[PDB]
Subunit: 326 residues, 4 copies
């Protein structure tokens, strides 16, 4: 019997996270080719093949890259044993949740990035990529949804968020914790997300050319209603409020979003507060105003779900149910 | 000798957390530590906190400093971190100003408001509290007004100084202070609001994947004096937002790059050429905090180099 | 159809956590009777009955109380819909894990305490007890093992630990996070512990009169071997090391525990470090020395498992397997 | 004018983290910020750190202070928090002493040791680092030697000042310091180890349900000069342990109550009558930290009231 390693596909969306114990290779025009050459220890754990999907800073991540990724994984599922997606850290948490809601492929999808440049002292990218491959290759990684692997830790795509502007340990599942820790190429999984994901969602992006327009507005003392008014005047399909405290709104932002909801604009109350749910049954009478409470979804994560909800329905009661199940 | 208690003034901005002259009744243990007098400044949910209440408060503390030994400000939790930093920069009174709220209603099981008020008054009464700037006292902890922020939507322990930690912990009506803010505050600032009836218009825009430039453009078209960006990661901007704010920063709109990320600095010398664009990096000030210091910076200067030095010192 | 509330039994082990909006009742000699009168809102959610098992400070918690509790729950399971155990906070995390490993009853067991005295301003006990009852009454609480409810949060008995000496928010599942948050009497459960618990363990305490002798020793610079020697000289069945870093031992403590393991004393390496696993395959050659690595079990939690392991086997390979499954 | 770099001395206590004269090679960016000279003091895993190495180090820094502008101590992570506090109390040199280690081997993928060393040397070279006591630099953060502790078994970000927060963050070879330890350190302590070849014997005992008194009794029978209790909760003791330590505290054994709980003070005026029993409360010092200050307190006094005041000031 021949030992056979799993086939893992690396989909690249940006710059390389591994590069400058340096392996000696000829740098080519394809970033993902350079990455794999930078981390030759990948051969000990997987048969790796890399495709460069786009090449952007994740601060310029957008709906089209999302649809391109979901469709590619869903189309390519039978050709590999697992996927690693190399991504900028700034919006990795949004991409991860979009893919958590739209991937129908039943093999592991693992997102990975680097908080330090590949050229810097003590670059984190090489060992992060090695651990993302470990994760993607582990049969125990299946049926856990789309994952993020950073800093030796397996994180679910729904709760993971960037907590610190610079720290290599920045990625944390701040409400419900990580799924498993990685030591010496092995994962001890003690949790799985209960919210429905991947093949258990109704979201089917296979034929979509675009996503519903959903914008985010911020609340603070003496908040302007000019941003909320701008999104309404453009006919936005939905607005996510980054509310103060438990999803509360400055009165002038409240007044604009109540009027919008009455015309049929979907309105989701989230919070600028970095941990904890925007709860139903607090100080806002959601049912009266036609508003949706986001739960533990932060504003950027609430936008991802609301866009997908709006491919299915514009009924705020149906949108609330989606916000309570996914 | 007759033992004398310090005179503490509670200024109320909302409902009761434990009305405002009543509080000697509601928490009678306050009589053991202070002579408390109460005044109602305004009565609003802090989600509707505004520039007018800020100016009223700074003016009230500054004018009434001689009359009392310390102030406690009762306030809603939602925007307490904004008001604390606003007062931190505009108070000139050299006596403790301590903000306090409650995460559970006064009428609720295990309401946190009573003990929080008790510990706020302990803090305002402690001579060791002087010269530490405006404070926030919540869950047995003394927090500096610059770093303090609401970290959880519902948890009584929500208030944390998430970058530099608390100044002290309160046990048995005593504080063991082990820290004090280095950044300049109170009477070491140039900000003097004694004569202002309004503050510069400063708006906040959010960054995320596929971010619309319509918010940024709505503020630029209104002639806002400044815009704070809640950027991604290390203060980065979605391209369309970056385009609009690059245009604003050379047309009379100050632009501060902050971050939607809950901890850590938005740094100079990262991915953004701040000098080319006329932008200011916020450092550890989160977007709503950076808004406070931008509004106060704009009372003094419109020069981006000068605003960046204010962001570097306060 | 009559609305019927669940029957919940409160087993008390110490002082009351609710007492001095004060309800007016006559204080009796039974602490748990006074507790229920202190929290009259319990009637809105449950038919509550209370038994005082012992009355101790949890700093004096001990094996006999553990056996008395497991046997009482296992014997009384058919007489109620759920159990709340009122306990001191100091050792609640140890009790919770013991009960997580020995309860065979398939109804919720929820442990609760208070970080402030029942008589103090802003006492936490009343609302904690109300939330423990909510938890014990929720059908969604079943099959999650033994639980701790503190500060509006449902925590699994394995990972929960006391993180702060005074904070009402002190209880956290520091490695894998909470199971669910409680808002307005309702729980949004998003996690369940993967490690085997309750009816899926082999531990059966029904007939035990005592538990194997397991002690704990601490590592630090210039550590004394006198404590480890004392436990060996007494014929302790097991020793748990609170190691430095990844379960490392000062050489003189190492030497004493290696000699002990050779005579058949079970030795488990844990860590004084408050988060993270004591891993296999680090700097200690466990297999050579006959040592067991504790994983994410802190020293006090490793003792609870090792005592129960030693009712089943004294084979260090079998004890490791138990430390990898429960 | 010719620009001059500061002279930095690395003292090594173990293997390389990036031998000790080599490190100018291994991290050549060090040549841009300092003139580095390396000396090997000892070469041990920090799990075997001991009183002899502590005395050697304090004596070496104190004697060699004039010779250099700053020291970096390379050390194993397991007992770094103990050595840092020991040096924090015994260093009299008024120049920065910065400890550093690595959570991944030098030979491992994405080893943390290089950048950690680079940032340690930045810290030791910064004039702003002076007068802040002995420091620990790990994961882009400057941490005070009193509060710093290892919070995770394997995480590169393990070192945190868990009660009072970091002093500053390091970005692009610069530090923005916003805090400094209030507790007395270095040349503001009475502890002088220049003439000591040994330290008082101080042992640590653990509390948990059904705790054996055999550890405590083994230390008492050996005639230990002090015992630190890693108590439950707020420094509480299992009854049998309490009985043995109550006996010790009036028979020539100093007893400090600390806590196995990872954050928060063991307070005076809680469940234990410290005065009746002759016990000392450790405050925020965790058991291994309290051991350091007890050993140094016992060089000066055996009086429990006097030890408690040392625990209240250092």
């Amino acid at each position: 019997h021949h030992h056979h390693l799993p086939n893992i596909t690396i989909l690249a969306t940006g710059g390389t996270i591994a590069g400058g114990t340096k392996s000696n290779y000829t740098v080519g025009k394809v970033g993902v080719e350079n990455l794999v050459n930078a981390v030759p220890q990948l051969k000990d754990i997987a048969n790796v093949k890399g495709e460069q999907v786009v090449n952007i800073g994740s601060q310029d991540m957008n709906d089209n890259v999302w649809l391109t990724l979901a469709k590619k994984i869903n189309t390519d599922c039978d050709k590999t044993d697992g996927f690693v997606i190399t991504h900028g850290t700034d919006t990795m948490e949004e991409t991860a949740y979009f893919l958590d809601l739209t991937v129908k492929c039943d093999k592991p999808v693992v997102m990975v990035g680097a908080m330090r440049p590949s050229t810097s002292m003590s670059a984190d990218g090489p060992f992060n990529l090695y651990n993302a491959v470990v994760t993607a290759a582990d049969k125990a990684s299946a049926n856990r949804g789309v994952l993020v692997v950073m800093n030796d830790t397996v994180l679910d795509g729904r709760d993971v968020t960037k907590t610190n502007t610079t720290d290599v340990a920045t990625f944390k599942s701040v409400n419900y914790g990580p799924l498993g820790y990685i030591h010496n190429g092995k994962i001890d999984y003690q949790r799985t997300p209960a919210r429905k994901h991947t093949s258990d969602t109704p979201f089917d992006v296979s034929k979509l050319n675009e996503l519903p327009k959903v914008g985010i507005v911020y609340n603070y003392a003496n908040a302007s209603d000019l941003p909320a008014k701008a999104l309404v005047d453009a006919g936005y399909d939905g607005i996510v409020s980054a509310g103060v405290g438990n999803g509360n709104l400055y009165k002038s932002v409240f007044d604009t979003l109540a009027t919008a909801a009455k015309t049929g604009t979907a309105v989701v109350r989230s919070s600028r507060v970095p941990t904890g749910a925007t709860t139903q049954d607090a100080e806002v009478d959601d049912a009266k105003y036609g508003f949706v409470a986001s739960g533990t979804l932060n504003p950027q994560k609430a936008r991802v779900l609301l866009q997908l909800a709006l491919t299915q329905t514009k009924d705020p009661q149906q949108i609330q149910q989606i916000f309570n199940q996914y």
